[PDB]
Amino acid sequence: SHSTAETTLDSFFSRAGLVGEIDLPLEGTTNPNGYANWDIDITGYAQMRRKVELFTYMRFDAEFTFVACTPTGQVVPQLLQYMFVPPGAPKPDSRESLAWQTATNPSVFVKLSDPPAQVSVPFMSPASAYQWFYDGYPTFGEHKQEKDLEYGACPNNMMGTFSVRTVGTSKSKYPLVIRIYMRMKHVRAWIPRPMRNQNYLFKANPNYAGNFIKPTGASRTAITT
């Protein structure tokens, strides 16, 4: 090459896109308790996991901002403050849990009229870095023949969740619409692996079906031009 100033790596990775969507129904049947918990599950969606699966060894912090509005784009003066529970502590199950009274958990409160919120959280996972693949048995216990009582629900791998409540004596009477954007701050990778070509059947397993697919069949016949 001759000049590599315009070819800067800055544009090679930085792309903001919609990743999550959280709804707050005022009544419902799926969530009739009026509160929901959303763990950070990158593997939940296929379209984002395709970019991430090219990477094997990574550790980084996160930055999120929250916006709420109406389907017509009108703005309303509502204030929220967000509280985070470390992943080590178990997540609340019922409203009468002690997680809402914990004062030892740090919190940061910002308004909406101010410039957009910029918050960062450190890497608190006890491991060194996240591992997307594991050629073995995920449990790190001395027992290698039985299974844990909490099989299926293993929050020991994720990074926790957030709790949302409304300020006021009575419950809020407006549902909100919120969209979330995700990004990486540092990019460092070691072992390059191929991505996926066919579609996914299950959310947590890459298994396939008996109807095989082909990358392309554009050429009617190879014998002719």
Binding site: S1, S14, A16, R50, P115, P116, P122, K185, S219, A222
Partner: protein, 221 residues
């Protein structure tokens, strides 16, 4: 009371804005960096990877899966036509969608670089003959005759040398030239020899590949 001016565009959300925030806990120390003898810093490592390209996309049966990776050649055909490579364009459909670079171009528009092809001969120990692979330069149409093929750049392929032959296309961008492969001569063997053989091809790119413009296009799904 310090005077300050309010610039327009305060509540706008910017997708490309890189921001940094102070950590909530300044006391926890992240895990130390792991030292490894071999170190790799740049994405250039992928540019030298070899990928196989195939043309016979006709069959779709389950029990014909393994034969896809090659294309057969037989002595029954005489001075016909071996393979017809489509227009070389990673963005468009064809053999290039399986390659790594073509997928990388799915968010991008303009590309340029050099192309190289390598061929090795896997015939019988007693056979004699001559093969020739040539790329037609731009401007020239598809070769109707071998005379129109010879005016372009051609490389002699002897059977004593296996793979040291290198052909380079100086520059490809996005209109362009075409490449065609004919039977230089029929492969003939005496009695007690197999009547069918197979040919393996290689394709790679040089260091002069660059990117200019990003695109907000996703090919999935």
């Amino acid at each position: 009371g310090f005077p300050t001016e309010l610039k327009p565009g305060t509540n706008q959300f910017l997708t490309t804005d890189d921001g940094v925030s102070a950590p909530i806990l300044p006391n926890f120390h992240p895990t130390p960096c792991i030292h490894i003898p071999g170190e790799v810093r740049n994405l250039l490592e992928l540019c030298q990877v070899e990928t196989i390209l195939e043309v016979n996309n006709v069959p779709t049966n389950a029990t014909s899966l393994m034969e896809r990776l090659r294309f057969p050649v037989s002595a029954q055909a005489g001075k016909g036509e071996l393979c017809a490579v489509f227009r070389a364009d990673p963005g468009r459909s064809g053999p290039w969608q399986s390659t790594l670079l073509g997928q990388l171009c799915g968010y991008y528009t303009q590309w340029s670089g050099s192309l190289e092809v390598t061929f090795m001969f896997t015939g019988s120990f007693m056979a004699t003959g001559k093969m020739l692979i040539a790329y037609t330069p731009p401007g020239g149409p598809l070769p109707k005759d071998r005379a129109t093929a010879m005016l372009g750049t051609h490389v002699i392929w002897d059977f004593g040398l296996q793979s040291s032959v290198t052909l380079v296309i100086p520059w490809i961008s996005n209109t362009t030239g075409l490449v065609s492969i004919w039977y230089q001569t029929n492969y003939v063997v005496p009695i007690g020899a197999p009547n069918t053989a197979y040919i393996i091809a290689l394709a790679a790119a040089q260091k002069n590949f660059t990117m200019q413009l990003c695109k907000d296009a996703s090919d999935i799904l």
